[PDB]
Each structure stands twice: as structure tokens, then as C-alpha cells.
Ligand binder design. Sequence first.
Ligand code: CL
Ligand code: CL
Ligand code: CL
Ligand code: MG
Ligand code: MG
Ligand code: MG
Ligand code: MG
Ligand code: MG
Ligand code: MG
Ligand code: MG
Ligand code: MG
Ligand code: MG
Ligand code: MG
Ligand code: MG
Ligand code: MG
Ligand code: NA
Ligand code: NA
Ligand code: NA
Ligand code: NA
Ligand code: NA
Ligand code: NA
Ligand code: NA
Ligand code: NA
Ligand code: NA
Ligand code: NA
Ligand code: NA
Ligand code: NA
Ligand code: NA
Ligand code: NA
Ligand code: NA
Ligand code: NA
Ligand code: NA
Ligand code: NA
Ligand code: NA
Ligand code: SR
Ligand code: SR
Ligand code: SR
Ligand code: SR
Ligand code: SR
Ligand code: SR
Ligand code: SR
Ligand code: SR
Ligand code: SR
Ligand code: SR
Ligand code: SR
Ligand code: SR
Ligand code: SR
Ligand code: SR
Ligand code: SR
Ligand code: SR
Ligand code: SR
Ligand code: SR
Lengths: 145, 246, 119, 115
Amino acid sequence: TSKKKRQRGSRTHGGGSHKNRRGAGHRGGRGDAGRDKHEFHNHEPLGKSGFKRPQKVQEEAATIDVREIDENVTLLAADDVAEFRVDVRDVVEEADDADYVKVLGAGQVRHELTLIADDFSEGAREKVEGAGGSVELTDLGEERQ
Amino acid sequence: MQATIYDLDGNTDGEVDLPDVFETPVRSDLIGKAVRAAQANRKQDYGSDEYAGLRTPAESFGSGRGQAHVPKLDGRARRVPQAVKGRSAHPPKTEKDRSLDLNDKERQLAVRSALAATADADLVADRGHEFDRDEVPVVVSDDFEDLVKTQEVVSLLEALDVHADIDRADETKIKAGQGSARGRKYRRPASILFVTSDEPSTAARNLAGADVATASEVNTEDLAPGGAPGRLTVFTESALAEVAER
Amino acid sequence: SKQPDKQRKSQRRAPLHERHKQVRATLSADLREEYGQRNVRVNAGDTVEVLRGDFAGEEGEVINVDLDKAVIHVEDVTLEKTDGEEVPRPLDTSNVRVTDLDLEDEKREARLESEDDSA
Amino acid sequence: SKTNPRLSSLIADLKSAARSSGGAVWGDVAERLEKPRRTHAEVNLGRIERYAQEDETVVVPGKVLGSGVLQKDVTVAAVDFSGTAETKIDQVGEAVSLEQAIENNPEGSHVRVIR
RNA sequence: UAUGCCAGCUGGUGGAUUGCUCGGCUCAGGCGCUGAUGAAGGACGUGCCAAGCUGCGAUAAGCCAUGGGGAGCCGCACGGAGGCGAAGAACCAUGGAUUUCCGAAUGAGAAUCUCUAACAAUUGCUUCGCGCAAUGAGGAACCCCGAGAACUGAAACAUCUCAGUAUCGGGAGGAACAGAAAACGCAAUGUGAUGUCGUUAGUAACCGCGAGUGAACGCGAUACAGCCCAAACCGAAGCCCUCACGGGCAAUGUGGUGUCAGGGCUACCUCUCAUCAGCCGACCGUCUCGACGAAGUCUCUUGGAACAGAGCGUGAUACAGGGUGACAACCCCGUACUCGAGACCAGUACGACGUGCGGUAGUGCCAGAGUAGCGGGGGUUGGAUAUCCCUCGCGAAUAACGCAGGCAUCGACUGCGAAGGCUAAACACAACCUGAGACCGAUAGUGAACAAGUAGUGUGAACGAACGCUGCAAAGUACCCUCAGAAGGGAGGCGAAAUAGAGCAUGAAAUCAGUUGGCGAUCGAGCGACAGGGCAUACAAGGUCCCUCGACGAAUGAC
RNA sequence: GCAUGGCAAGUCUAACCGGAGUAUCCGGGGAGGCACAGGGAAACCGACAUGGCCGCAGGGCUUGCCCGAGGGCCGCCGUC
Ligand SMILES: [Cl-]
Ligand SMILES: [Cl-]
Ligand SMILES: [Cl-]
Ligand SMILES: [Mg+2]
Ligand SMILES: [Mg+2]
Ligand SMILES: [Mg+2]
Ligand SMILES: [Mg+2]
Ligand SMILES: [Mg+2]
Ligand SMILES: [Mg+2]
Ligand SMILES: [Mg+2]
Ligand SMILES: [Mg+2]
Ligand SMILES: [Mg+2]
Ligand SMILES: [Mg+2]
Ligand SMILES: [Mg+2]
Ligand SMILES: [Mg+2]
Ligand code: NA
Ligand code: NA
Ligand code: NA
Ligand code: NA
Ligand code: NA
Ligand code: NA
Ligand code: NA
Ligand code: NA
Ligand code: NA
Ligand code: NA
Ligand code: NA
Ligand code: NA
Ligand code: NA
Ligand code: NA
Ligand code: NA
Ligand code: NA
Ligand code: NA
Ligand code: NA
Ligand code: NA
Ligand SMILES: [Sr+2]
Ligand SMILES: [Sr+2]
Ligand SMILES: [Sr+2]
Ligand SMILES: [Sr+2]
Ligand SMILES: [Sr+2]
Ligand SMILES: [Sr+2]
Ligand SMILES: [Sr+2]
Ligand SMILES: [Sr+2]
Ligand SMILES: [Sr+2]
Ligand SMILES: [Sr+2]
Ligand SMILES: [Sr+2]
Ligand SMILES: [Sr+2]
Ligand SMILES: [Sr+2]
Ligand SMILES: [Sr+2]
Ligand SMILES: [Sr+2]
Ligand SMILES: [Sr+2]
Ligand SMILES: [Sr+2]
Ligand SMILES: [Sr+2]
């Protein structure tokens, strides 16, 4: 049995005095009425802030953490196994509709990896090299200068 | 497990591997959910005329003549819900979404589960079907498809100690209620489901309570009419194998 | 259609030429064999046996066939009015069976004897 | 108000075992499964690898998922595993149903709850 | 015990309830224009008797032909009389005939009539003559182009909102509109006409930066289709009417060429299956209609009736639905299978006829002006500097040029050729046809299951109800008595039932008549709850209860 | 938000297409959405698959002592 189903006989259906559930006055106005007066509480404050650059002058980088790559090495058997070599571009989803691929250094790297990507974060390298690995900046990647 | 194959004479003619799906654990909640959705999805949208009760310039006189403020026209009360000939306050609405969604995985799981309920004589018997057989579902040679006469299928079912269920379904019920006024005077027990592979069995379809289907598209309702698992079924050598990859 | 309202409606409002089928009656065993039909449209000449009402068991000549009301009068199947006069008690052909045909009409006979068509 | 027949049976069996054998885990696990689904455990392998030890049955009062790497040779007992979870686990150890565990160890001894 | 209170009984009143459904409501598919050759609508006629509805039109519920159909028929409508039908009627399909008056209403006028040959009025062509033609008005909504509110929201209110909504003017079609880039701008080595659907997204953008408003490119789909002029170069090589003769148009340019894969011209190579025009002309599919179509009407019992129960039997590519005196696959219509016709798809697709694609070199020959663009003032938009449009004013270039890429200018780069035009399909609606339903079931559902837009209200615009059910069969009550009496009453007849006898299935409550129980003319008012007494009570569906004594015997507790 | 259920580092298809028992249903369709990294107006940069200590449930043991998921208090890391 639901709450609705139990209201017959109650008269007020939970509204309290039958003088309560009328028009918008019972809501202090329609929509966001009073968001600066009677109901200012918890509302974001009023005002303009910042600016936006045109959407076609904006770059969307496709990112990935070493942790993701590293935990799936053996499974990514369909990619180089040298002294592993992996072109991150062939790993990241959304890499297509992105302006470039970037390797971030979140997590650990328990293997020696030769990563190929358009860009890496300082920590991404330190960890990769740290595990006797290497980092190869793609041709596009050659946009840092 | 293995299932016995039968020839059109009712004699055993070898046997095959009962596909793994028939091992799927029976899940009546998922099966019921699946049947509930298929049943809802074929319901038609309805609702009263949106202007019903509203075609009137009826006005209220307000205070003054010792009468309640009810819209009236030609001395007759109108429009409002409490008024006879007035509008319906909260009537059936056409814009209402009367369909039910169901994830493909969840639906397919119910199909497999309904399939598995078909291989359990105890369940099949609990569902209500009448028969003197022990092995279930009933598997038959693909020649079954070449049959043409209904009475031929009758002979085969009797030879298989399964015709008893058709006698069960050979009783129609004249329902209580006004369904009758809308074309739903009768209803009847669900009997044997015949699952073939090329085309539904034209020869078996007219049997009392019988349902015909094809391995490629047999659904949860076929296998569990009303959402009750364990329907007495009869597969076809090929149907059995094809149904395995559902 | 399958809807009861439409079925009865199509029957009550069927044009005249479509009402002949509302006055058809099953044929005796012999007649069915003779003309290869299970039933026929009762004519004011046929002989018929009543198989269901209070007059079940009686046989007589058909004296009238009303298409407007889809009923037939059969000789001796009557009711006695208050004054005493004897009037016919209308019968639904569905409760009757033809035991002898009136083939005085070549078109009818030809129709019955044909195979592709039935009378 | 559970709707799944098997989940109900599992809970019933978990209680029978706890009331008739030297194991308070089963009943404990039964109590957690009786709680709303949102509270049930949803554990990835990475967590089992961090707190599990060999020859100690890992018991998950919920479902095991496939994120992370499991190397330890442990037996994981859970209400359910994702396809990948059960695969990675069977490789270096073993994946078993809470129904099997209850049968091989009704006393519920040498076991660690992970959530 | 009067007047009277409470409850019930018999009979009314009333029409709830239950059951029933010729009507609604909603959804889906199909289909889709009519009219001066006088539509749609209205008026008045039209029947043996004819008021209403339906039909029809002085040939008047109908006339003719072809096919279907069939022994009956003369609509709703169950009468009387009479007639028609084997000279094949009724009925149905297709085609044709007739088709009064008003009505766009068109000779002039007029509340449906009148007065003295008429396309009235506006147009095009023109034989300059109404000679040949067009327009006008209708249609449920859908569609296109214009005009354009307020209540309301913002808790007031003015910008904003409601909303380009309601409503108004004009106009087309079966669909409309749009549409082969002076595009896009995931900026690219990229996309490639246009609708529409999903998404992009409540994103960008707007906004007393409040409340609110709100795209696009792209992507996934549906369906796919591209072409024609102006000019250059030609210059009468041409078009329209007429059978013809003949006439009219046309140098202010008919016709050829050509159309951003730019074109033309001069000089060449090669070659056409592009395009444009015309001819032929479907399959299939979908919708509707139609033909054919299996097997019990066997026994006994109950009943007014078997379609019930019990017994025996049968068909099924048919166990959808309906009808028939009660629960019917097998009694009748249908239903499955198979077959036929029309409509739509579609004058489309294919096929065939003709035409002829394209490439090289040269050539500043051609390529749409109040335009592109700028300014003043307005409206509008998400359009913000960067939407679209109106208005006033100003105002260019000529492809070696010009426009666009979300502020202006200049260069570069990429895209693209405005100021001419046409264009199938995929999408909207629901009048019309058919199908369908966890919709309503006669105070419901349409206002309308019935006389329904009826009766009726208002000067008018406009407003607007209520009314469903005898029975299996009318067997719809003969004869007799009574009475002023075709009334009514009594008796009687029919039927299973008249307490089924006409708003005639059932027949609640309020309530009325008569009557039964209890109370009652010395007595007090939330009408009762709980206890306990009186009186009343056919059966059934409840069977307990009382007194002596004894056993048990909590709290409490004696003489 | 919550209860139940499927799947899970993923999940769900939308329009629409094919099939069919033809509005149901079977297959297909991942366009796109949300989740898988945040911080910053922007430019731009880009994180604990665990380092310490308490300790509930549960487990272990020689029955106070160990292990102690979740939780609690800190460290430390990304960015302004
Ligand atoms: Cl930005
Ligand atoms: Cl986890
Ligand atoms: Cl593009
Ligand atoms: Mg109403
Ligand atoms: Mg009922
Ligand atoms: Mg014959
Ligand atoms: Mg006139
Ligand atoms: Mg206001
Ligand atoms: Mg449009
Ligand atoms: Mg304000
Ligand atoms: Mg707006
Ligand atoms: Mg755009
Ligand atoms: Mg405005
Ligand atoms: Mg009504
Ligand atoms: Mg009555
Ligand atoms: Na109230
Ligand atoms: Na009205
Ligand atoms: Na709906
Ligand atoms: Na149409
Ligand atoms: Na009349
Ligand atoms: Na006519
Ligand atoms: Na004219
Ligand atoms: Na003229
Ligand atoms: Na206000
Ligand atoms: Na005010
Ligand atoms: Na504003
Ligand atoms: Na793309
Ligand atoms: Na009958
Ligand atoms: Na605008
Ligand atoms: Na201007
Ligand atoms: Na552009
Ligand atoms: Na009524
Ligand atoms: Na008493
Ligand atoms: Na996707
Ligand atoms: Sr409340
Ligand atoms: Sr109000
Ligand atoms: Sr509020
Ligand atoms: Sr304030
Ligand atoms: Sr994508
Ligand atoms: Sr007053
Ligand atoms: Sr008639
Ligand atoms: Sr009639
Ligand atoms: Sr195209
Ligand atoms: Sr041009
Ligand atoms: Sr710029
Ligand atoms: Sr009434
Ligand atoms: Sr209506
Ligand atoms: Sr007035
Ligand atoms: Sr009498
Ligand atoms: Sr005592
Ligand atoms: Sr999916
Ligand atoms: Sr922690």
C-alpha cells in the first residue's frame, strides 16, 4: 500500500490546514521567485563571473593515467613486446575526436614501458623512466616550445 | 544433459545434448518482469476528449440569488467536475507513456531462464500442464515441420503421452465482467508450445491452447505464459540446437 | 471484424442481396450427398423439418420467407390468437433442416448442381 | 522485500549454517545481505590484493568487480562476480560462490570479510 | 384508546442496482481536393394513405445500360389496401439520364421571388464579336504569406514573460514550404542541394545578467536528383490560332548556342550514353471489396426453449468474432487455406528514340545595381560588436573582379560566385474508408445510443436539454358482466412468467396507503453507547441458557 | 532521494534498419549521454592501484594476545 492510497478519508492529504495548498502563494511565487529576497537561502549569489573563449579556438586533450596503461599491459598483448612498447594513441578512447593524446602520471608503473604520445606530464615521465622506461614524443607532440 | 529424440511414430530415434542454457537457474522474478513489459507494450493509448464538458459558456452568478457559485447555462450547472455533464477532473490521458523499458541483458536473461524452466518436469507439472511423460521438454525429429494435418499432430502427441494437456485446454471460460462488450468474452488455458525452426507449425497451431513459435524468435511469453515458468514444450531437433545461442 | 458490435451491426444492416445467407438451412443427409453442399437458402417451395423449438419434430412446406426479418413460416407451425384465428409462428432457419427442394426454377437448380457455386 | 529467489535462498542457507556450526561470519554476512542493495559491497580486485592473504578465504558480502590487479593465490567467495572478475581471479587463484563456501566451510573458519 | 413515535409486512410511487449495447472516446493504417459543364450549403417540392428522418428532383424513396444477385420485393416502420417480380424484380458495383428555386450566383432587381436576351465584374488572347479562355466560392484540420493582443509569470511593475500564442486579412495543395552554395569553417590533404526524425543541448548566445528565453555546425538516420535562363557568338533559321485558306505575335529579339565539371570565339584531339525532351510502360507491395470454404444438430435427463449435465461421435492450414428460445469449432454467418477485382505505389522504375559528354592552346568577348556596402530610425532574433526584416538617406567593382570564414581595417590563407528560375522522394493533417482497444457503458461516454444541433431560449451574434430494454413467438387479450363509455373495473383467454400488458428485464432509498409488533392522551428534548428488565418471534442459515450441590479458588477478606 | 533488479570500469541505446507470430515480439543500430581526474576566469598545468596511528564487525590463538575489510584521526599528492 502506498502513501497516496491511504489518503482517502484524510481530507487534507497531508497538507496541514486546508487553507495551505492553494496557488503559488503557498510556494512564495512561481519558479525561482524571491531568490534574492524571501528565499535567498542556498541560492547561488547574483553576478557575472569570468568569460568564455570561442569554442573553435579551444583544444580538448584526450588523457590517460599510466595506472590504466600499466595494469593492462599483459592484456594489451596486441601491442609491441620489446626488451613493452605502446603507442598510447592506439589505447585511448575518444582519441579520435580529440586534438591530441596526453599521458598523466597517476598511480604506479611496475614495468618498463616505452610510451608514445603527443604529450606527457612531468610526473608521467619521472615514473616511466623511473621504472627503466622511456618516453617518445610524437611528431605532433613536437609542439612544446 | 542428454535429451531423447522422437520420430513421427513416437518411437525413440537417438538423442542429443541438451544445450547448456537449459541449465540456467530458473528466475521467476525476472521472467515475470519480462512478461509484464511485453504485455504493457502492446496496450493502446487512450483517454477522454480533452474538451469534453468544456463546450459551454456557462458562467457563475456569484453571490446574490441564494445559490452556490457554480457555472450555469440556461439554468443548468455545467463544466465543473461536480456538475453532471461537467468535465472529468483527472481522466485517462493520451499523452501518457504506457510502455515499460527493459535492458536487453535483463530481458535475454529472462528468456534463457524461461527456457531452462522448460526442462523441469516438476515445474512444468506445477505450472498446471497435464501429461504422463517423465522427460521434458519433448524433442522431435525435424520431419515434424513437414506435417500438414492437425489430426496427424494429434496422433503424435497421444503417442507421446502429452495430448492430455490439449484436453485441459479444450475448455473455454466465459469471463465475468464487461470484457464481453469489447470482444473479450472468452479465455482459455495455455497448453503446448511447439518450437520449430523454419516456420511455425501450421499443423499444430489450431490445437486447443497451443502456441507455435520459431527458435530464432521464441520469447519469454511463449515459454512462460502470464509470467509463470515451466510450459510444456516440444522442440524440433534443429530448434533445440538453434535455441542454444539465444 | 472481431468486435461484437461491428459483427451484429454488419448483420442487422446488410443490404437485401446479402440477407439470403441469413435464411440458409442445413440439408438432409441425402440432399448434401446429391448436391455436394452442406446447406442451402430456404425457398417458399422447400419442405423442412423443425429440429429445435417447441415444434421440434414437425415437418412441413415452407409458406413464406421474410428477408427483412430473416425468418420463415412453415405450414402447420402456428399459434392460436385470442379470437381463435391461427397465425404462423416465425422460425429461424438455423433451427430447421431441408428434406425436399422445390426446383421449379432452372436458375436455382443449375446453381445447386454446379460445383464452383452453391445455392 | 528482496525480489530475487536465489538471493533469498542464499540468505536462508547462510543462517542455517551459522546457527548450526562454529561460524558467526555466515550469519553476519546474512545480516548484511538483508540490508538494502545500495549498502552491499562492490569490490574491485585491487582491494582484495591489498588485504588478502593465502589460505585465508576472502569473503565478499556483495559482488566482486574487475578493476585492478590480483596476484595472490587466494580463494574469493562472493554473492557474484563480474565476468572479468571471475576470470582474473581464476587465473592466479580461485573464484567461488558463497553457496560453495558455506558447504566446504560451514564453521566459517579462517576467513576474512572484505568490502 | 384518538392525534401519534419506532420497526417490519402487502401494495404503490420512484428509477438506484445488476445484467445488456444500435452510441461514444482514443489509437493505427489507407486515402485525399470540389466549383461558371453553376460546387458546398439552403429553400420548396416528391409516397395510395405520409407528420418526422432518409432518399430523390416536375422522369422527384426514383428512370436506362453492363456485370453481379436471386424468389422474392414495395426504406427507417412490426399498418390497411393495392401492386411489382421467370419479359429474372428487390438488392449491390460501374457507367449514363433526369436534376425546380436560392446559393460564388454572373442580364437588372428581390428575406428563395420578380422584371426586360445577358460569362455581372476584373483580366489574357483576339477573328476587336464575350468569338476563345481565366478568376470568384467550398473543404476537418494540416500548409504558405501578411496583421497581431491581454489576462498571466517576474510573488508589485515598466525591459523581459505569457507569445509571434488567441484572434483577424490574403492564398495554394493533396500535401504545402524549402532546395542544387557569393554554403560549411569538427581549419581541413575535410564535408558537399533541401525537408524531416534522433542527438548535439537547456550546450553557445540573450537577459531589471532577475524571472525567464534559447539555437547552429557536426553526427546517426529517413529519402535521395539534379537541372533551366539572362548575356557573350548567331539574327528570323521561331511561336500561337485555323482542317485549310488565312490571321496574330516577333529586330524593344521569336528561335539556335549556353549556364562554375563557367561559357563563348579562333585553332585543334577525341568522343557521346552526361543532360535535356519526348515514347512505352510494369513486377512487387499496401489498402479495400469479393468468390470458395471442413466437421453432430445423435441418446437420456432437466427446461417454455438445450447452446446444460451425462453418454457416443467428428473437423481443424478453420479452437477469431457473431447469430440462433441458456456455456455452440462441428445448427447459420463467418474463420484458415487458395483464388479474383479495384485503388494507391505510378505514367514511376526499367526499356527504347533522339540529343551529344570531355580535353588542349590562345583570347581582359559574356556572366543579373539603387544591388554589395555604409549611415539615421524601428521591429525582431540565441545572435551577443557577430540574427533576420522594414523604413529614410547615401552608394561600388566587373572575374586582372567580388562575397564569406561570428567586432573594424589591411595582407596572407581556405571556401564560394549574390543581386533570374524550376525541381521527384523522405515529413504535416484527418474530412473519407477500414481495422483496433487493461477506454465509457445511458446522470457514464460526444451536447447528441432516442425527434440531436431535435424540442426550446434570445432582436441578433449566439445558446441548447431530456427520452435505451414486452415476449421464445404478438400468441399485443376473443366472449361475457358493469358503465354515459373503444375509458376504467370484474370474470375470462394466451405464455414458463402478465407482480412480462406498452417509458411493459431487474425494481434500492427518500416516501405514500393499508396493516403487524412494541410504546401511547400525568408528562421532557443530540434521538444513543454499555448493563439489566417487559412484551413480540414458523422453518433455514446461531445453540445455548437457568437452578441445588460439588471441584478449582487471584487480589481481597469476615461475622 | 529511496526500495527492488540487470550489467559493471563501464553502462544504456535514440531515431532508424532487417525479420516475424506484423503496434506485441527476435536481431541489429553506441550517434550520443552519464561514469571512468581534477583545479583554474583563462592561458595552462595535472593526482594516494596506500606511508603512520586508533579501532567496530569478523577471523585467528595456547582465550588476554594477534590479523583487523568498512569506519575514525593524520600524513602526503594534483591545481588556483
Ligand atoms: Cl573558455
Ligand atoms: Cl573497490
Ligand atoms: Cl564538415
Ligand atoms: Mg461528461
Ligand atoms: Mg460486475
Ligand atoms: Mg452444388
Ligand atoms: Mg441570378
Ligand atoms: Mg506579476
Ligand atoms: Mg515544413
Ligand atoms: Mg524581481
Ligand atoms: Mg522566445
Ligand atoms: Mg553553424
Ligand atoms: Mg518581444
Ligand atoms: Mg448523456
Ligand atoms: Mg419494469
Ligand atoms: Na487543502
Ligand atoms: Na455547447
Ligand atoms: Na502515449
Ligand atoms: Na481519402
Ligand atoms: Na413521411
Ligand atoms: Na442527381
Ligand atoms: Na467565366
Ligand atoms: Na469579347
Ligand atoms: Na504576482
Ligand atoms: Na497589481
Ligand atoms: Na530583459
Ligand atoms: Na565526426
Ligand atoms: Na440454432
Ligand atoms: Na528577427
Ligand atoms: Na537601415
Ligand atoms: Na564561408
Ligand atoms: Na439515460
Ligand atoms: Na429487550
Ligand atoms: Na558510445
Ligand atoms: Sr506532507
Ligand atoms: Sr484556481
Ligand atoms: Sr519557492
Ligand atoms: Sr537581497
Ligand atoms: Sr563516439
Ligand atoms: Sr455582496
Ligand atoms: Sr427493410
Ligand atoms: Sr424492417
Ligand atoms: Sr544526395
Ligand atoms: Sr551571376
Ligand atoms: Sr578577425
Ligand atoms: Sr436519466
Ligand atoms: Sr463529439
Ligand atoms: Sr439580450
Ligand atoms: Sr384477469
Ligand atoms: Sr484460598
Ligand atoms: Sr546494449
Ligand atoms: Sr582508510
